[PDB]
């Protein structure tokens, strides 16, 4: 896996070059925005349970066939597995925000998830929808102006969104 820094390092080593000023300056800005990145991680983490619980409930509300007997989320074992995958994806999204690179999420979580789901008959379109709900909740929690020094978190919010989008597309 890479973090934002080792990612750029790998690109430069492959060409046998020192980082360029553009590369160094880009990492400088990331550094300068670091408190926001940390607040983004903390805020999602602090609300993890309710992000999962509430998106799950809304998912089952809109898709009652998932919880009907014979549904994919019917029985407590399958409901537990389903709640667990929700939390796993949210967890790995927070890792990507923390390192500033998608690789932890792609390499350790999303890669081969579609195939996993196909074999079990987990409906990936419903997973994707659950993820999208978590995304919307997570974004509103991070953007919330209360109890925090005020400023512009649009870059970190956009990066965050992008990781949720990867998660939903990896199973959709």
């Amino acid at each position: 896996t890479f973090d934002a820094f080792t990612k750029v390092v790998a690109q430069a080593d492959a060409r046998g070059e020192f980082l360029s000023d553009a590369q160094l300056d880009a990492l400088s800005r990331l550094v300068a925005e670091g408190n926001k990145r940390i607040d983004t991680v903390n805020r999602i983490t602090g609300n993890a349970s309710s992000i999962v619980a509430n998106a799950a409930r809304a998912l089952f509300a809109e898709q009652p066939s998932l919880i009907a007997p014979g549904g994919n989320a019917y029985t407590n074992r399958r409901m537990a597995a389903c709640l667990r995958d929700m939390e796993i994806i949210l967890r790995y999204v927070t890792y990507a925000v923390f390192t500033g690179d998608a690789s932890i999420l792609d390499d350790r979580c999303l890669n081969g998830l579609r195939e996993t789901y196909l074999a079990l008959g987990v409906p990936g379109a419903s997973v994707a929808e659950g993820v999208r709900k978590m995304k919307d909740a997570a974004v509103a929690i991070v953007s919330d102006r209360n109890g925090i020094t005020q400023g512009d978190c649009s870059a970190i919010i956009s990066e965050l969104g992008s990781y949720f989008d990867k998660a939903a597309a990896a199973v959709a």
Binding site: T1, F2, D3, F5, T6, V8, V9, A12, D13, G16, E17, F18, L19, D21, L24, L27, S28, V31, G34, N35, R37, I38, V41, N42, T45, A48, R91, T94, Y95, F98, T99, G100, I104, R108
Partner: protein, 162 residues
Amino acid sequence: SKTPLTEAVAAADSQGRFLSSTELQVAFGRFRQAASGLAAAKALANNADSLVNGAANAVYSKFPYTTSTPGNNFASTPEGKAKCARDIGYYLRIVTYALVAGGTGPIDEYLLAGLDEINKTFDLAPSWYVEALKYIKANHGLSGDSRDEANSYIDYLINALS
């Protein structure tokens, strides 16, 4: 590879846990450190030719046998001098990568893993690289946190070479 950010996530991942205050503190220490890391990388980069050819010259002067003894492993031909300056160039560039990463990761991955094997097979004396590194340390002219971090990687490599 090893940096504060990848290590924190690997720890949390291996416990199946969300990041917590512990890893947030890691991120804080990373971001406290990074500007001087980037500046150290930038300075070494800008001063690469002087440092590499200076270090080369300090090795040849410390070990005159290296420029006057025939051999594939020696710097007695233009080819061998070029191999040696190349190598010193690699050490320096990969040090800059460690400063960029804020960890030994780039060193471990691109230089340190296999180093002993390489030095042995090609009959390259660890003491030659130790000397080149001592020169870089004595001559990069860095101050403060830049110095401290850059010297930690340099000494990391000297330690690895002895």
